[PDB]
Design a binder for this molecule. Structure first.
Ligand SMILES: *[C@@H]1O[C@H](CO)[C@@H](O[C@@H]2O[C@H](CO)[C@@H](O[C@@H]3O[C@H](CO)[C@@H](O)[C@H](O)[C@@H]3O)[C@H](O)[C@H]2NC(C)=O)[C@H](O)[C@H]1NC(C)=O
Lengths: 49, 49
């Protein structure tokens, strides 16, 4: 009900390690494919936990 | 951004839309060309007479 929101910008993100870490039970992407994230560019990324 | 299996849907939507646009343009051009051919035949008759 009070989900915490974090902002990430001004950095390089290596999604390869996160995707390869099989600890995640569900890893589901809608707008983009998981593989291609390592090649895209975003203005800023919000992480809601 | 998308893997081929997911991309195919968006690619097909774009293909359908652009094909529709091209067909409409070609039909309009055909009708306009028929009109211009009628005008050109009239002009040729005017010259000859
Ligand atoms: C949260 O902590 C865990 C545990 O560290 C991270 O998972 C993996 O942790 C290892 C080491 O901390 C990271 O490097 C690894 O090094 C070993 C050699 O020591 C190597 O064999 C592995 O392939 C890996 O490079 C690893 O990047 C990291 N992720 C993996 C293995 O998929 C986890 O990354 C931490 N969470 C975040 C957001 O960083």
């Amino acid at each position: 009900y009070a989900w915490n929101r974090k902002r990430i910008s001004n950095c390089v993100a290596d999604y390869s390690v996160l995707y390869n870490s099989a600890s995640f039970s569900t890893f589901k992407c809608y707008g983009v494919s998981p593989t291609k994230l390592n090649d895209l560019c975003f203005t800023n990324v919000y992480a809601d936990s | 951004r998308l893997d081929p299996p997911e991309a195919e849907v968006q690619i097909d939507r774009l293909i359908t839309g652009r094909l529709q646009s091209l067909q409409t343009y070609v039909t309009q051009q055909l009708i306009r060309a028929a009109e211009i051919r009628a005008s050109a035949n009239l002009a040729a008759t005017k010259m000859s007479e």
